[PDB]
Design a protein around this nucleic acid. Sequence first.
RNA 1: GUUCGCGAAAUUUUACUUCGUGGACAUUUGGUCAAUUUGAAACAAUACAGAAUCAGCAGUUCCCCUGCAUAAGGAUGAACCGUCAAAGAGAUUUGUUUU
Length: 52
Amino acid sequence: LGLLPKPEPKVKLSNMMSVFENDQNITDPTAWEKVVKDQVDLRKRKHLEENE
RNA sequence: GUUCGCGAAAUUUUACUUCGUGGACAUUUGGUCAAUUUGAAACAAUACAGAAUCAGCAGUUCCCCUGCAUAAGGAUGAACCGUCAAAGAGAUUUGUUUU
């Protein structure tokens, strides 16, 4: 219906290589590393925040 | 009656022409492109078999690990002990080592 944003793909350090949807995958190697890692840390952050 | 093959004759061995001889000697069918053209009905145009592929996440089902919640259930540590507050009136007592 459009009331909720379309979900973006979950990216891990394993799956990191094979997701080409984002801009920076191959062309900027290290910033894409930072993107992925901060996505992971962000999910774990959501978990701990919910628990607290 | 049609052809192929062997033997004989007339001429220059194969060749034509004829005699004696061994076979072979049926026709059809199962063979239609579909789609489209206002007319006494024909196959004439008009096409003409051309009549999408790699990758990612998530979601259902079970399992393990780690959190937080909730229901129950347990184990252990924590040195010191419980039958009021204010004001007013009445009754009783009160020379030299530690100020």
